[PDB]
Amino acid sequence: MEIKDLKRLARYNPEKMAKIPVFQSERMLYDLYALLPGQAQKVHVHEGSDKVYYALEGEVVVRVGEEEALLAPGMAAFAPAGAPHGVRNESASPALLLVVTAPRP
Amino acid sequence: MEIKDLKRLARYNPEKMAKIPVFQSERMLYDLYALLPGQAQKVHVHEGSDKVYYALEGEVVVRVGEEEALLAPGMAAFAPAGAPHGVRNESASPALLLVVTAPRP
Numbered sequence: 001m002e003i004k005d006l007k008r009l010a011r012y013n014p015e016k017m018a019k020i021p022v023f024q025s026e027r028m029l030y031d032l033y034a035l036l037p038g039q040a041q042k043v044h045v046h047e048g049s050d051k052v053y054y055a056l057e058g059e060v061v062v063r064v065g066e067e068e069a070l071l072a073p074g075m076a077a078f079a080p081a082g083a084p085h086g087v088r089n090e091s092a093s094p095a096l097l098l099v100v101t102a103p104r105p
Numbered sequence: 106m107e108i109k110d111l112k113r114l115a116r117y118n119p120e121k122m123a124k125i126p127v128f129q130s131e132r133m134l135y136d137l138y139a140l141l142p143g144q145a146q147k148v149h150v151h152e153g154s155d156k157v158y159y160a161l162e163g164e165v166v167v168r169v170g171e172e173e174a175l176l177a178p179g180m181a182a183f184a185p186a187g188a189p190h191g192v193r194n195e196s197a198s199p200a201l202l203l204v205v206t207a208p209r210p
């Protein structure tokens with residue numbers, strides 16, 4: 001079986017938000033998003049995929065549709081297919097998210 | 106948007122493993138599994154769904170195919186469609202897992 005210690009996979013990118021693939025199949029993307037202060041995933045729309053952001057470390061501002069939320073460790077936000085969504089690190093510390101997208105875009 | 110504090114949703118069941126739905130759509134099941142010592146998710150096979158177990162608290166023994174692993178906090182294991190899989194709490198403390206299944210069985 002495929003098994004990973006997500007703590008070990010964590011890494012950052014000074015140029016832009018790091019997208020770290022953990023597992024992948026046509027059925028889903030299981031990734032880690034590592035955001036340094038000021039970094040973000042630009043707002044976008046997935047025609048037929050749902051996405052869920054879960055905060056592992058730090059805090060980020062998640063945008064889904066016409067609403068925004070402060071996602072702190074232990075919190076998860078759902079972005080249904082068709083809804084514009086994104087995430088921004090507006091804090092002064094790094095943030096790490098477990099992000100699942102299904103099916104694979 | 107749907108947003109939840111998973112820490113608040115956590116709960117246990119003395120009769121059997123608790124399955125706590127967080128978010129759900131035809132595209133995926135996003136659940137929390139709460140296992141008291143001795144509890145487990147019986148081994149089974151999903152014809153067309155992949156599943157990923159992520160340990161939030163405690164440790165569990167995950168079985169996928171002909172292999173078993175000790176999943177400690179921060180570790181994730183992938184169970185591809187068609188593979189017999191299950192999870193058992195063989196420790197002396199409770200365990201909490203974030204479990205994603207896609208698509209919804």
Ligand code: NA
Nearest residue numbers: 021022023024
């Ligand atoms: Na991988």
Ligand code: NA
Nearest residue numbers: 126127128129
């Ligand atoms: Na819910």
